[PDB]
Design a protein around this ligand. Structure first.
Ligand SMILES: *Cc1cc2c(cc1C)nc1c(=O)[nH]c(=O)nc-1n2C[C@H](O)[C@H](O)[C@H](O)COP(=O)(O)OP(=O)(O)OC[C@H]1O[C@@H](n2cnc3c(N)ncnc32)[C@H](O)[C@@H]1O
Ligand SMILES: *Cc1cc2c(cc1C)nc1c(=O)[nH]c(=O)nc-1n2C[C@H](O)[C@H](O)[C@H](O)COP(=O)(O)OP(=O)(O)OC[C@H]1O[C@@H](n2cnc3c(N)ncnc32)[C@H](O)[C@@H]1O
Lengths: 573, 573, 104, 52
């Protein structure tokens, strides 16, 4: 018996933990995955000395924990087997593929992560706010009020994640890019640092935020928390919440301890599902909400008819550039140079404080030192100079999010031929109109690796605005990236596979009114009809958004937690 | 002040910990890497429910922690940059390459792993014994005595690692392969299960051994060890051991706490280096043993002249096969089949205990169940059937180690087209003659990511036996693999990049006599001349070996630990 | 649909085709050798504005075909090499080889 | 294929690609010497590699 139970230990789950363990509830949290992030439970895997000295290698950590959601049956022809080897007569169901999935209407790139801390153990930590156009209303007919509430919620969310916008302010590459872009779009667009959940510790080490940052996930009571009550149970698959006959309350959470193989049931007053956009929906449909199986409109669901419909995922375009000759020369524009590199008479000098210096003394000092200490190196940028982290946020005239940066998650065998200091990544993210015909559904025959109903997508980017904007987005990336340099061969401008972007939303969408707004949960994230069932995550977001959704989902959880504290009484300790 | 200090937390380091913490020494161990394996410190990363349900993904975990030792300057031509982008006039030193390294005499595949538990957090857990031909002598002129000692040492080593040979005995694929090979080579070669440091927990879960298995790496005293004394310090780079003027004893270990940036010195009575074959040699050469810089025979080292010479690494050949039609039909040879799959009259039956049954009832039952429960599936092998794990050990008439199996570390984007149940991996490993001209050396100008002398290889597989055997090895793999099925397209027979195999040996080699045997340490693994300095690891092994070296290195550490216990007195507690 | 945009290149003295006095080609003639880079200045700016134009204009007709993404081709693949024996009125003033009748 | 069959490259620089998975028994280069009709005079970084 707990006061509250949480399914999932991602940062949205941890938002609920932090709020509710702190309010004095007896909390239990289960995760289907295991603790594997070192002694700080649920922390960012990027935060080791070894990874920030070899950041190129972290792509492999991310790849190692992205398990594809739905993989269609494979139809590749292999006709150079030896005559003696067993050979197929058909393309039969092999290697865990999903025979329900149409390869041409899939989110082939969608994947899930089963570890403690969830995807926040590997994420890129960008946490922009949504402007009105991207955000669901929290207050009808009172825009300035709706604005205040979101400002209040986001401000707390930024606290929990330790969101900041100046962690890269000392980077020559970052400023080089930022300044050129501002200059080029003078009074048509604004550029700034990407808001990032991150704390710099030194010039060569950044403590990337994660679930741990939100809530440290240590069992309580403990010494630094002697009146709080929290237990985390890793390696527990949660399978069904049990409805009462009235469909007014949840009575139990049914679980599978993966290590012993035993199943149990768990009672709480308050049930919170934060298993992610896909696995929330799976858990619910496994529990009698929505509809199991291939959509059949001639049998409507009894509960939550909009569950798994109106799903959104963002179009992503990508390239990388090599920094222009012009920009590179500009780095060292303040330097007077005498002699020829490599002789003892060679000299690179600047005049501090000189009025006609285009850069600050700190920048000049770095450049001078690098050029004198490394006279074999043909570039003015210091070896350890931190990466760019630039954005122009979504606007109506440019309704896409942009990151102009360096991401651990590169999409191909990485280059060694071109100097890393010249390379900038470009990622533009489009907003997707939510549509009823775009669905995530669960097979009533096929099951996944945990013996749950197999997830299946039926998705295409909507015709209309979504398609036009995506193409205008691609074109924008081409136009804007040219200002900084030419495309890097092998990273030419391209749309990424659908869902690789991992910003799936709308799978258990929020709204004021279940029928009128075609939704699943209300603005307290409570499941309509149910007193004690709450959903947290990107699944909640009902709007077409381009920016990274996590901070938004977090803000919604905070408001959800206000409701719980005002409506349920913690047990005595 | 400690009684003993150990550098490195790999399983060889942990062998020293286990022996010495258990003998009652005050032990400290430092690792340059960090704890990141979940709550069991130093354990196998493969031991999560999620990885053994998605084993294909573990390749990414291994890749994420293999940092290449020496990467030559890159000379690839990129001539499709945009005219505007900064373009090189030369192939200058970019992206951490090593300008000292000749690309044509490198071990390009050699890599290191900096995490707590070392490479044992990701290794494949094969732990064969070496036969006399592969093993260094521990006793001169008394072969039967030398045999007994090694039998004694290996038997303990197998205990520590939990080595077993029956963990896969229930696998249809494993037995299918094993039995065919035995049959084919009848009375010319013997096949058995690869000895593996592993404990099966269930039919779908194997607890893979690691450093943790050897020693749990928890700080002591603690409740289950209240009179023992051990501390582990992660994120500490050890840089130099300090010699006394006499070169008879080590006086301190010099360290760098990576998290605070501060340097300290550490006193112990006994210093143990187990940082791996490369990083032991680096630590030593950084400390005035051997020779820093490009080999210069006209300036001999003062100490340990053979340090970094005579290095061995094994030739590795690889392919994968698709199981023959014949073998696949044999699986179901005992089945009577009526009707046609997919109708309710279809029937697969066998007669238990029937004299003419070629397989045991358990095998038949599995096959019958699979064929009746999955009538859409064209193969008689059950979905969860464990992988093959077969070997014929090195002999004189076949002087190579062989693994006929399924390895998490596949060498290419993996297939989805061919059913996984049909696929077997083939890895044959050759022995390399140790030669003086084959060297690992450290630059006196270039430094690595931890500001230590940059490692550089000068290696070629020796002409003579080594080259002939390697080619006869390749041919053997072709001949033997054909017995089981044809090559899988995309995994055709090939030599792997030198050192990818990660069995590097001989870098601080063991022998009776420093000059006569051209070696660094004696049979107690003590550095010649030095009372209190010991080396552990594959670096010690002075012979040409084909089998996987870790259990051998462990046995040597055990004997090293006998010496220490008989020669140094633990402090009072 | 294929999209090919072709830029103009400023002629420069330092951009040269020359022939080895030691190395010979398959017909035992002096081996051809290039010393070429696209000129800084207008040539480089125009080439990049050209790439951008192709992106902007091609979008009007449809999205890029995967495997044929926008890219600069290897120098000279285009096979429009010019200026190697260039024409002009006056040999010294116009730095040239042949006159307007193409006579040397 | 007809076009490719009649375009002979004008100047091909000496090749520097590393092949380190030869069998130990096979003849192996110690240098990137002039092979297969390459032109040692040509700087790979200032070429018209596509000219034919
Ligand atoms: C992978 C990734 C994600 C990512 C990113 C780049 C990459 C490479 N960049 C980010 C960006 O810069 N910022 C942005 O806002 N998001 C970014 N993302 C996405 C981010 O990681 C996710 O949006 C965020 O993690 C969502 O958080 P939430 O807490 O909602 O979900 P979760 O992290 O997926 O964790 C859910 C967990 O629950 C578990 N689970 C799943 N099913 C069950 C069941 N049945 N029972 C018990 N537990 C369950 C998981 O194992 C998991 O930990
Ligand atoms: C990666 C791998 C290795 C492997 C294998 C397959 C793969 C993919 N398969 C194995 C096989 O089946 N069996 C076989 O016997 N070996 C197999 N291997 C090899 C195995 O992992 C290694 O042989 C074994 O781990 C060697 O153990 P040892 O304890 O000698 O070395 P280590 O694991 O590399 O750990 C050394 C550590 O010390 C650290 N370090 C390095 N430098 C320093 C300094 N300067 N200061 C402090 N610490 C240092 C490391 O971080 C490390 O943990």
């Amino acid at each position: 018996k707990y006061d509250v139970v949480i399914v999932g230990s991602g940062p949205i789950g941890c938002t609920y933990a932090r709020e509710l363990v702190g309010a004095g509830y007896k909390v239990a949290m289960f995760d289907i995955g295991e603790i594997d992030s070192g002694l700080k439970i649920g922390a960012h895997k990027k935060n080791t000395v070894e990874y920030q000295k070899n950041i190129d290698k972290f792509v492999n950590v991310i790849q190692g924990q992205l398990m594809s959601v739905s993989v269609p049956v494979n139809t590749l022809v292999v006709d150079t087997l030896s005559p003696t080897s067993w050979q197929a007569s058909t393309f039969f169901v092999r290697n865990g593929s999903n025979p329900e999935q149409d390869p041409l209407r899939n989110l082939s790139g969608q994947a899930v992560t089963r570890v403690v801390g969830g995807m926040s153990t590997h994420w890129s930590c960008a946490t922009p706010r949504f402007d009105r156009e991207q955000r669901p209303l929290l207050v009808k007919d009172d825009a300035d009020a709706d604005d205040a509430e979101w400002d209040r919620l986001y401000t707390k969310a930024e606290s929990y994640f330790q969101t900041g916008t100046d962690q890269f302010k000392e980077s020559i590459r970052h400023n080089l890019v930022l300044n050129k872009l501002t200059e080029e779009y003078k009074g048509q667009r604004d550029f700034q640092q990407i808001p990032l959940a991150a704390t710099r510790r030194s010039p060569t080490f950044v403590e990337w935020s994660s679930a741990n940052t939100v809530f440290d996930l240590q069992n309580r009571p403990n010494t630094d928390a002697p009146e709080e009550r929290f237990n985390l149970f890793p390696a527990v698959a949660c399978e069904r919440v049990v409805r009462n006959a009235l469909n007014s309350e949840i009575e139990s959470l049914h679980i599978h301890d993966l290590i012993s193989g035993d199943r149990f049931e768990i009672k709480a007053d308050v049930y919170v599902l934060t298993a992610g956009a896909v696995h929330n929906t799976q858990l619910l449909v496994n529990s009698g909400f929505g509809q199991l199986g291939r959509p059949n409109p001639a049998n409507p669901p009894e509960l939550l008819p909009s569950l798994g419909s109106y799903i959104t995922e963002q179009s992503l375009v990508f390239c990388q550039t090599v920094m222009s000759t012009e920009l590179i020369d500009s780095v060292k524009s303040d330097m007077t140079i005498r002699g020829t590199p490599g002789e003892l008479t060679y000299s690179v000098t600047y005049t501090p404080g000189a009025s006609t210096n285009k850069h600050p003394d700190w920048w000049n000092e770095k450049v001078k030192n690098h050029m004198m200490q490394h006279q074999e190196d043909p570039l003015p940028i210091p070896f350890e100079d931190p990466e760019p982290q630039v954005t122009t946020l979504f606007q109506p005239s440019h309704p896409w999010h942009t990151q102009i940066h360096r991401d651990a998650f590169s999409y191909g065998a990485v280059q060694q031929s071109i100097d890393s200091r010249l390379i900038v990544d470009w990622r533009f993210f489009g907003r997707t109109e939510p549509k009823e015909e775009n669905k995530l559904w669960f097979s009533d025959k096929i099951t996944d690796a945990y013996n749950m109903p197999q997830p299946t997508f039926d998705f295409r980017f909507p015709a209309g605005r979504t398609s036009k904007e995506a193409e205008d987005m691609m074109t924008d990336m081409c136009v804007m990236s040219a200002k900084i340099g030419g495309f890097l061969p092998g990273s030419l401008p391209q749309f990424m596979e659908p869902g690789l972007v991992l910003h799936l939303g709308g799978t258990h969408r929020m709204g004021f009114d279940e029928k009128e707004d075609n939704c699943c949960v209300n603005t307290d994230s409570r499941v309509f009809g149910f007193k004690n069932l709450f959903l947290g995550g990107c699944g909640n977001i009902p709007t077409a958004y381009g920016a990274n959704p996590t901070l938004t989902a977090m803000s919604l959880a905070i408001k959800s937690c206000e409701y719980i504290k005002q409506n349920f009484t913690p047990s005595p300790f």
